[PDB]
Amino acid sequence: IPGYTYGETENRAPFNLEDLKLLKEAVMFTAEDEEYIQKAGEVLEDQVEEILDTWYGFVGSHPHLLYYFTSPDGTPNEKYLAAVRKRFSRWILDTSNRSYDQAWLDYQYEIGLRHHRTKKNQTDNVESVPNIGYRYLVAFIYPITATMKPFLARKGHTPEEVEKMYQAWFKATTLQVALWSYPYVKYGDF
Amino acid sequence: IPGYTYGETENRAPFNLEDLKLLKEAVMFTAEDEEYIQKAGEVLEDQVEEILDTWYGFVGSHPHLLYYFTSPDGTPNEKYLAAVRKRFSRWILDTSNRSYDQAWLDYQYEIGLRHHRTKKNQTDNVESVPNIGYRYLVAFIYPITATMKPFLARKGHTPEEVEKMYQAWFKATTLQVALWSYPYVKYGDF
Numbered sequence: 582i583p584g585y586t587y588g589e590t591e592n593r594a595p596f597n598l599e600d601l602k603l604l605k606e607a608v609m610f611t612a613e614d615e616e617y618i619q620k621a622g623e624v625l626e627d628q629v630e631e632i633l634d635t636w637y638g639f640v641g642s643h644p645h646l647l648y649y650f651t652s653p654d655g656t657p658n659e660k661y662l663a664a665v666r667k668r669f670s671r672w673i674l675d676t677s678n679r680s681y682d683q684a685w686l687d688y689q690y691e692i693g694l695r696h697h698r699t700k701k702n703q704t705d706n707v708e709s710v711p712n713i714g715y716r717y718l719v720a721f722i723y724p725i726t727a728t729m730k731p732f733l734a735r736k737g738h739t740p741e742e743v744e745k746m747y748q749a750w751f752k753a754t755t756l757q758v759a760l761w762s763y764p765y766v767k768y769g770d771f
Numbered sequence: 772i773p774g775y776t777y778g779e780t781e782n783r784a785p786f787n788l789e790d791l792k793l794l795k796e797a798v799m800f801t802a803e804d805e806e807y808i809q810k811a812g813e814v815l816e817d818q819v820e821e822i823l824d825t826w827y828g829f830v831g832s833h834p835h836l837l838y839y840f841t842s843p844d845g846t847p848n849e850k851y852l853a854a855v856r857k858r859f860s861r862w863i864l865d866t867s868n869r870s871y872d873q874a875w876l877d878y879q880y881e882i883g884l885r886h887h888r889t890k891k892n893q894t895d896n897v898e899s900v901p902n903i904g905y906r907y908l909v910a911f912i913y914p915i916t917a918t919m920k921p922f923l924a925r926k927g928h929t930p931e932e933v934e935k936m937y938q939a940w941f942k943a944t945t946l947q948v949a950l951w952s953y954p955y956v957k958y959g960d961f
């Protein structure tokens with residue numbers, strides 16, 4: 582997967598497992614969620630192409646969102662979209678299947694950097710907008726969860742079990758966006 | 772309510788109603804959510820004392836969270852806790868009842884400043900930790916929604932109605948924390 586460097590990044594994250602422990606506590610994430618996030622992964626894995634179509638369909642319906650994938654002429658850079666899409670697809674699996682350990686934290690730092698002006702447009706060597714306003718990274722916690730919700734019911738568990746996979750995904754997505762804030766936030770304010 | 776200055780803030784927010792419309796789109800908030808957030812705060816009005824108890828009970832049971840309300844010697848400042856609790860109580864109603872317009876936006880900027888080192892500890896004239904690390908503001912999107920969830924069902928609405936009130940609360944909470952990122956974010960990166 583071009584551009585995908587999980588576990589082999591150039592930098593160690595500026596946060597460690599003790600930071601992660603304390604943030605899991607803030608998001609109410611426990612060993613029970615670890616179990617249900619894996620089950621979410623099992624439910625979602627064969628539905629990935631439909632998930633991506635649904636996700637990028639949302640992004641594409643709003644010009645000020647599609648904007649972050651645009652060439653200077655205001656049109657979508659289709660090379661950029663395609664390349665990112667393969668890494669997003671793998672992130673769905675990573676969220677479900679990776680241990681949230683130090684290597685995981687290292688890639689969380691890398692993903693933040695990539696949304697931020699620090700590294701945006703460098704992975705795919707494209708000309709696009711320099712920065713994704715942090716306001717929308719936070720905003721997107723909601724649609725990520727709303728996108729996944731229908732797919733978690735299709736395979737075909739009880740409302741009680743679906744709710745647990747959904748709640749685990751919500752906690753896991755919030756935790757990640759919190760980490761991704763690091764390069765956006767004024768030094769010492771994170 | 773001491774320190775509560777809604778509609779009476781010193782400054783205008785660096786964001787406007789056009790920003791708010793674009794952020795609402797990013798969190799999938801529509802006229803349909805206005806109706807159910809209104810209903811939510813009709814359901815929640817009666818139960819605010821129990822909600823506050825549950826909420827500060829979560830904060831209180833994690834030393835690194837209770838931390839943010841502590842005096843320099845490490846002990847919780849009870850004056851600070853009781854005063855802020857009155858404004859948080861009002862915020863529950865404001866989220867449900869206020870029209871999200873320019874004056875609401877203005878109070879959003881104020882709330883973010885109060886969590887940040889810019890205005891933390893001034894409203895109540897207390898001496899406490901200087902800054903709430905932004906990682907936890909994002910993290911708290913989760914427990915805030917989890918706390919409201921049980922209370923939204925207790926007035927005997929249908930499961931689809933409860934779900935709709937919850938999803939509206941989730942959208943609205945996410946929208947607010949995105950706006951509160953303003954004083955935390957590197958100038959120009961928001």
Ligand code: HEM
Binds near residue numbers: 584640722
């Ligand atoms: C909950 C919030 C979000 C999640 C879970 C998410 C997910 C991801 C993932 C997994 C990648 C690939 C990372 C890699 O390189 O391995 C990525 C990159 C990217 N995302 Fe997001 N994203 C979020 C917020 C946003 C927002 C608000 C936008 C704006 C439309 C956006 C647009 C992009 C763009 C343009 C890239 C390519 C950045 C680059 O040049 O490297 N993302 N995103």
Ligand code: HEM
Binds near residue numbers: 830839862894895907
């Ligand atoms: C979803 C995220 C959060 C929400 C919805 C929220 C809600 C609120 C509200 C409504 C207020 C009072 C605003 C006013 O003055 O009218 C407040 C203040 C405060 N909150 Fe939060 N809060 C969040 C994140 C956090 C976090 C992570 C902490 C860490 C414990 C925290 C602790 C405090 C403190 C210490 C104050 C007083 C700040 C000051 O000195 O003015 N909050 N919060």
